[PDB]
mmCIF file of C-alpha atoms in Angstrom:
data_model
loop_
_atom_site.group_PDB
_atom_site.id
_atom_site.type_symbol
_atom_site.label_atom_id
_atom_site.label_comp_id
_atom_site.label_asym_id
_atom_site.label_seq_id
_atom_site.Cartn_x
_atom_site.Cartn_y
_atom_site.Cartn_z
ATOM 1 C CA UNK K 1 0.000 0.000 0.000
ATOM 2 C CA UNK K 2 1.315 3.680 0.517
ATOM 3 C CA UNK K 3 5.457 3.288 1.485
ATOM 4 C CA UNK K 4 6.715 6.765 2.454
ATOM 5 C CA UNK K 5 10.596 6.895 0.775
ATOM 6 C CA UNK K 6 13.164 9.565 1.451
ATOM 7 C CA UNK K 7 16.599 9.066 0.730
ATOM 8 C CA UNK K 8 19.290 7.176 1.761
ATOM 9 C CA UNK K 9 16.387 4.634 0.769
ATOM 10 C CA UNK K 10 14.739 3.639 -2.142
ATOM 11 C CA UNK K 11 11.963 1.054 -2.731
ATOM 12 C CA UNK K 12 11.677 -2.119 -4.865
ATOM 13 C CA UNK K 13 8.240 -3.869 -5.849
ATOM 14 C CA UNK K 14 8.684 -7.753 -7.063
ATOM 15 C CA UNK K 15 6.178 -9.469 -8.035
ATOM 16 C CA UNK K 16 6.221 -13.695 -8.021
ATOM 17 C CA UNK K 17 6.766 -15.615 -10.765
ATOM 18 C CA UNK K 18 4.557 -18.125 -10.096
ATOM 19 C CA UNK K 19 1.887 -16.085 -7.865
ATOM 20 C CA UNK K 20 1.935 -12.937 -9.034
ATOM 21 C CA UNK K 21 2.213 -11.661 -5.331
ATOM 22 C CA UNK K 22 4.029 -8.142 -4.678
ATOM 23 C CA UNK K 23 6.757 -7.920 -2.258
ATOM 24 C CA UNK K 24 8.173 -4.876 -1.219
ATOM 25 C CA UNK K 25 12.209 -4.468 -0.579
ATOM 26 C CA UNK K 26 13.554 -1.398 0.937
ATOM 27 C CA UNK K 27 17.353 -1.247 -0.231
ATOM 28 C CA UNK K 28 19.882 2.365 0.215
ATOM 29 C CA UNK K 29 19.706 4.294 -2.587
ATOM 30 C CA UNK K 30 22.493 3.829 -5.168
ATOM 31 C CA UNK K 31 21.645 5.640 -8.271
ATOM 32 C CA UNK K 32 22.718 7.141 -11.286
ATOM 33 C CA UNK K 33 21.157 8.923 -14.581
ATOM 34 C CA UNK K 34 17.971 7.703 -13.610
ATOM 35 C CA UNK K 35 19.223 4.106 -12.973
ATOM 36 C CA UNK K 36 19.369 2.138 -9.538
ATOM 37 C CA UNK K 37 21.071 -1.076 -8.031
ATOM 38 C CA UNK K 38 19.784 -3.362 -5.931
ATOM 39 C CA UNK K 39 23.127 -4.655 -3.762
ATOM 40 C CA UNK K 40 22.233 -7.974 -3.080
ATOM 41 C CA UNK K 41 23.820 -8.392 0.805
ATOM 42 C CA UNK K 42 21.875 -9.648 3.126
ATOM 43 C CA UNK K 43 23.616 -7.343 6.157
ATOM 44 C CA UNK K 44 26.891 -9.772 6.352
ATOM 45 C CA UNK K 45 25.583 -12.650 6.452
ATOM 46 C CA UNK K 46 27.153 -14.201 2.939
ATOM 47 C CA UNK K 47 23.958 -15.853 2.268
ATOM 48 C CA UNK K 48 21.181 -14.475 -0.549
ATOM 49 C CA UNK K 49 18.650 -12.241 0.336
ATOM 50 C CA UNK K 50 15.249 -13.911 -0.687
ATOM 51 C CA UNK K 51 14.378 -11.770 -2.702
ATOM 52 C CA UNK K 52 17.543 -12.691 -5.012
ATOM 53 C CA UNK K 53 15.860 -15.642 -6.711
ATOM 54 C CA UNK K 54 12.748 -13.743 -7.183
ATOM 55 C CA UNK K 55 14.264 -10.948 -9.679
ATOM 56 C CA UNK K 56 16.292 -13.653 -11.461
ATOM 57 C CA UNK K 57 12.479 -15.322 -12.085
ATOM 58 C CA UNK K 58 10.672 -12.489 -12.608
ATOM 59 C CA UNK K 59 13.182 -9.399 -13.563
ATOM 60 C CA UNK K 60 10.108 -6.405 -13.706
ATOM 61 C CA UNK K 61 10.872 -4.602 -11.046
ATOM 62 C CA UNK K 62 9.000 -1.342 -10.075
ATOM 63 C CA UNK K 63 10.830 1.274 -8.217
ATOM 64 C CA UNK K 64 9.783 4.346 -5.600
ATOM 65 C CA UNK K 65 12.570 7.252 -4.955
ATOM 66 C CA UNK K 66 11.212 9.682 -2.853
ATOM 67 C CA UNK K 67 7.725 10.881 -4.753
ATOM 68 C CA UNK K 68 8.863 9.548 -7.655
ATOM 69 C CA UNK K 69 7.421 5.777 -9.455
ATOM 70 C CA UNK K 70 9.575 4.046 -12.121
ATOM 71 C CA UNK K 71 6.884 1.141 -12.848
ATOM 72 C CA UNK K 72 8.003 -2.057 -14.341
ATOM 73 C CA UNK K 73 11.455 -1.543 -14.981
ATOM 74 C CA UNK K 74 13.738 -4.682 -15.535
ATOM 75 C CA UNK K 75 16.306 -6.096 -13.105
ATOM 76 C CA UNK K 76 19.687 -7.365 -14.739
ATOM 77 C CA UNK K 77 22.099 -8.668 -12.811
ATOM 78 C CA UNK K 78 25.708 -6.895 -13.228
ATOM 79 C CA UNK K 79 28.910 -8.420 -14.700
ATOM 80 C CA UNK K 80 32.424 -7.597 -15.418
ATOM 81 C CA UNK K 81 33.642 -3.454 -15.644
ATOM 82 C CA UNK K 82 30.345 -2.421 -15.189
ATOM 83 C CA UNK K 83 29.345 -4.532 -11.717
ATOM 84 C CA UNK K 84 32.853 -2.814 -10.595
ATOM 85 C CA UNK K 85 31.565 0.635 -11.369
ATOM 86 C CA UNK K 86 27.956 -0.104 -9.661
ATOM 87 C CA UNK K 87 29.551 -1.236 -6.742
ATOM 88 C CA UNK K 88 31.838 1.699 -6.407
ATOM 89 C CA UNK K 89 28.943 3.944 -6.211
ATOM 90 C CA UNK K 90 27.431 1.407 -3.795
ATOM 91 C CA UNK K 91 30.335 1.569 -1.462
ATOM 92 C CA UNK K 92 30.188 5.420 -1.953
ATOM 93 C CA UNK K 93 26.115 5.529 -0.683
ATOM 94 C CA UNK K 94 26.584 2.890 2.402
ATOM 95 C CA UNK K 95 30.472 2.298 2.777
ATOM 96 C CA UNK K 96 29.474 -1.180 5.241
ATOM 97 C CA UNK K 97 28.874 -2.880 2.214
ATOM 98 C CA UNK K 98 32.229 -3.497 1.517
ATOM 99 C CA UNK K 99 32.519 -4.728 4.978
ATOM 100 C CA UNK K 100 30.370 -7.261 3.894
ATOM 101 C CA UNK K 101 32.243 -8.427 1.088
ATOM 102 C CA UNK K 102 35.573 -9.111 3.323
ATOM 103 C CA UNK K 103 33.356 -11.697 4.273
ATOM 104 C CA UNK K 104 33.378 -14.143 1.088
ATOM 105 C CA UNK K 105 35.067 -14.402 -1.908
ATOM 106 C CA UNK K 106 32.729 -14.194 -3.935
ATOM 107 C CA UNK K 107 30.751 -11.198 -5.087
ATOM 108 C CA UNK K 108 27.890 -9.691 -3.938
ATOM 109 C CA UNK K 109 25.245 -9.929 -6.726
ATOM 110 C CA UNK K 110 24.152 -6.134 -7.791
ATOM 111 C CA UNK K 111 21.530 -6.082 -10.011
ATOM 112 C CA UNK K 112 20.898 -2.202 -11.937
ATOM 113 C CA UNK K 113 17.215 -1.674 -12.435
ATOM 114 C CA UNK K 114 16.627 -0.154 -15.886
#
């Protein structure tokens, strides 16, 4: 229903694959020329957020900055140069997410909604 959003925070609407239900996942706000990322962390613990599977099944993704509605955009999850850039500005916005990636080797998934 109505989610009040002021930065650092934006808001991400999934919807299920299979049930069509909308789940709503507060991430910070990492943005750029009108794109975002969703860091996939899940606060240190090196497991995935559950929300993680449902954007690889279902990438339209709707998001809320502030007043502002970006319906049905499309989650892709980042590779190579331009995952590096993402999470630069990531680490910028909320610097204890690279905390969180001393603890595994391998990297956190960012997705850039689009």
């Amino acid at each position: 229903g109505v989610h009040v959003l002021d930065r650092p925070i934006v808001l991400f609407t999934t919807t299920g694959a299979k049930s069509g239900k909308k789940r709503y996942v507060p991430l910070m706000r990492v943005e750029e020329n009108g794109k975002y990322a969703m860091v996939a962390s899940k606060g240190g613990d090196p497991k995935h957020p559950s929300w993680y599977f449902n954007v690889k099944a279902n990438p339209t993704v709707s998001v809320q900055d502030g007043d502002k509605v970006l319906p049905d955009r499309t989650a892709r999850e980042l590779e190579g140069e331009e995952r590096e850039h993402w999470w630069k500005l990531a680490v910028e916005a909320y610097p204890p997410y690279a905390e969180y990636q001393t603890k595994t080797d391998r990297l956190i998934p960012v997705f850039i909604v689009e």
